[PDB]
Amino acid sequence: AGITGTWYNQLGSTFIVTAGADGALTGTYESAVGNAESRYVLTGRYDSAPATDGSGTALGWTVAWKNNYRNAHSATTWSGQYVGGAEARINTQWLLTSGTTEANAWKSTLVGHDTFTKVKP
Amino acid sequence: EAGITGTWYNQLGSTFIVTAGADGALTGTYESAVGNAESRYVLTGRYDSAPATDGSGTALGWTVAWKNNYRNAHSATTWSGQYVGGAEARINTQWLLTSGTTEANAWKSTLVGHDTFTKVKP
Amino acid sequence: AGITGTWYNQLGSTFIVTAGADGALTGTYESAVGNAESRYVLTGRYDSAPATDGSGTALGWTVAWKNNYRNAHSATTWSGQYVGGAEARINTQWLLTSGTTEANAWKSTLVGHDTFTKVKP
Amino acid sequence: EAGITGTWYNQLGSTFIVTAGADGALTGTYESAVGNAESRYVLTGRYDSAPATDGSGTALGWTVAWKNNYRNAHSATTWSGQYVGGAEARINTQWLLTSGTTEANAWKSTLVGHDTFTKVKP
Numbered sequence: 398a399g400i401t402g403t404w405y406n407q408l409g410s411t412f413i414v415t416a417g418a419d420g421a422l423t424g425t426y427e428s429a430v431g432n433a434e435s436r437y438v439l440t441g442r443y444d445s446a447p448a449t450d451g452s453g454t455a456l457g458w459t460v461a462w463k464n465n466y467r468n469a470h471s472a473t474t475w476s477g478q479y480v481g482g483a484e485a486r487i488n489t490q491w492l493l494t495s496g497t498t499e500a501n502a503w504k505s506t507l508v509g510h511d512t513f514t515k516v517k518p
Numbered sequence: 519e520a521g522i523t524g525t526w527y528n529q530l531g532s533t534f535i536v537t538a539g540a541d542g543a544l545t546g547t548y549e550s551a552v553g554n555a556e557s558r559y560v561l562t563g564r565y566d567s568a569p570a571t572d573g574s575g576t577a578l579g580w581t582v583a584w585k586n587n588y589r590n591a592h593s594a595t596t597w598s599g600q601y602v603g604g605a606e607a608r609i610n611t612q613w614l615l616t617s618g619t620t621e622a623n624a625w626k627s628t629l630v631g632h633d634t635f636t637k638v639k640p
Numbered sequence: 641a642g643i644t645g646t647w648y649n650q651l652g653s654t655f656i657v658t659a660g661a662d663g664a665l666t667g668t669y670e671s672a673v674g675n676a677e678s679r680y681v682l683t684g685r686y687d688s689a690p691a692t693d694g695s696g697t698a699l700g701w702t703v704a705w706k707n708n709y710r711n712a713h714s715a716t717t718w719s720g721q722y723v724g725g726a727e728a729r730i731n732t733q734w735l736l737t738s739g740t741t742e743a744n745a746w747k748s749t750l751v752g753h754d755t756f757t758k759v760k761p
Numbered sequence: 762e763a764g765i766t767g768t769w770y771n772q773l774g775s776t777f778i779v780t781a782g783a784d785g786a787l788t789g790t791y792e793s794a795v796g797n798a799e800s801r802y803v804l805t806g807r808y809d810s811a812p813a814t815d816g817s818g819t820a821l822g823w824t825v826a827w828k829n830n831y832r833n834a835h836s837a838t839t840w841s842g843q844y845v846g847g848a849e850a851r852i853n854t855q856w857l858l859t860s861g862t863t864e865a866n867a868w869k870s871t872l873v874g875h876d877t878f879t880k881v882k883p
């Protein structure tokens with residue numbers, strides 16, 4: 398019934414988001430992996446007037462991995478599309494950049510892919 | 519966060535206007551020199567508000583959805599990178615641009631690249 | 641029983657490969673998608689002495705999309721790992737670069753992910 | 762293919778020695794300035810042997826597995842990019858470096874980046 402809701406990726410991370418009428422994404426992310434505990438703030442944007450031809454809805458969001466419990470000195474962005482239907486899905490690719498010195502900046506950024514559904518593990 | 523807050527440009531001639539809040543928020547507007555884009559677009563992101571002090575960059579990311587009250591490309595970009603302070607401040611990024619597609623075309627939905635931003639003097 | 645064999649990705653593309661003893665990958669690729677028909681030459685490398693701790697086997701390969709039938713003026717590289725087991729798998733991330741002018745070089749490279757098994761569709 | 766064939770360097774100080782064959786093959790050796798690497802490693806790749814003549818680059822890619830008779834990092838890099846000819850010839854790339862990992866650690870297996878190669882004069 399839309400982007401707003403509670404989503405889970407293939408690792409069991411929990412993505413709770415609200416899609417504002419004019420394109421805002423606002424919520425929290427709890428990661429099952431990495432140097433992370435509890436919830437982290439997220440913010441992003443989505444296409445609030447998608448095509449009407451069967452295409453998905455483009456979107457993206459960011460988390461910086463600092464909260465009251467931990468600071469990993471890193472940030473992830475997810476870029477992807479929402480696909481509506483009986484089992485709604487958000488398919489993404491992500492970039493996780495850690496703060497580095499300039500000379501190790503070559504090993505600063507991990508890449509991967511996450512797919513989200515509203516099915517709770 | 520004084521360092522990040524300001525006006526920036528990338529190697530394509532795009533410009534990025536941003537304000538870094540005490541809570542880790544990035545807000546502002548983006549004007550792209552390339553692609554299916556005109557005028558300013560809203561951006562929103564996050565940064566590490568308590569970075570290391572050991573000669574590391576400050577991790578940050580932001581998103582633009584390419585819809586404004588003038589044009590809609592049905593697409594969104596995220597930039598992931600780090601701010602490097604000092605007199606010649608830079609934001610070094612890699613980005614992902616996803617277009618809305620049909621399922622059969624999803625394999626060709628996402629472009630990747632890298633942008634370098636240089637800060638300019640208010 | 642190893643990297644050598646016939647593999648299929650989630651799109652139904654066919655990847656036929658031989659893993660040489662000292663690290664070569666040599667074979668053909670037939671793509672179910674894009675500006676492609678029939679087989680294309682591939683070449684790559686893999687770790688011919690992987691860790692013995694349960695880790696996967698790192699690898700990569702390239703196809704340039706020119707054969708006797710078509711030339712798309714593009715090339716893909718896949719980077720990933722082989723995971724042995726009862727349903728062996730190769731998990732990859734890929735980059736597809738098209739030849740462009742310098743000023744459109746910003747839109748030259750697509751990214752995605754392919755997972756391969758030996759199960760024929 | 763005279764253009765591609767030769768010695769190249771990237772912005773990290775790594776060097777790439779390559780021979781472009783008539784059949785579309787790339788062969789050679791790579792010496793990395795960074796990471797868990799020493800001495801030369803085999804590379805192998807492909808390029809478009811009949812590129813456009815319309816002022817486009819020539820698409821190419823190659824792979825190195827980081828095992829040689831001296832060291833083994835249990836990892837591999839692929840570079841995907843284009844050759845831009847002329848007097849100041851360049852190869853502009855983006856790359857993926859995958860390390861062998863356990864299944865539980867596969868989420869952190871792959872680094873991404875970009876390398877610029879400049880040709881040097883035999």
Ligand SMILES: O=C(O)CCCC[C@H]1SC[C@H]2NC(=O)N[C@H]21
Binds near residue numbers: 432469509868
């Ligand atoms: O370890 C660190 O630097 C901090 C935590 C990184 C967490 C990531 S990993 C990719 C993305 N998807 C997911 O479920 N979590 C995030």
Ligand SMILES: O=C(O)CCCC[C@H]1SC[C@H]2NC(=O)N[C@H]21
Binds near residue numbers: 550554591617
């Ligand atoms: O055409 C579309 O879908 C909409 C416009 C995309 C713009 C992008 S391209 C990479 C990034 N860097 C920059 O200066 N602009 C953004």
Ligand SMILES: O=C(O)CCCC[C@H]1SC[C@H]2NC(=O)N[C@H]21
Binds near residue numbers: 649651671676716754
């Ligand atoms: O259209 C073009 O430029 C030429 C053909 C590109 C084919 C690709 S798309 C990603 C990769 N995986 C797969 O099954 N095929 C390849």
Ligand SMILES: O=C(O)CCCC[C@H]1SC[C@H]2NC(=O)N[C@H]21
Binds near residue numbers: 797856
């Ligand atoms: O540490 C390891 O796993 C083995 C060594 C990795 C080397 C890489 S890093 C990006 C690419 N560019 C370059 O000059 N070298 C390669």
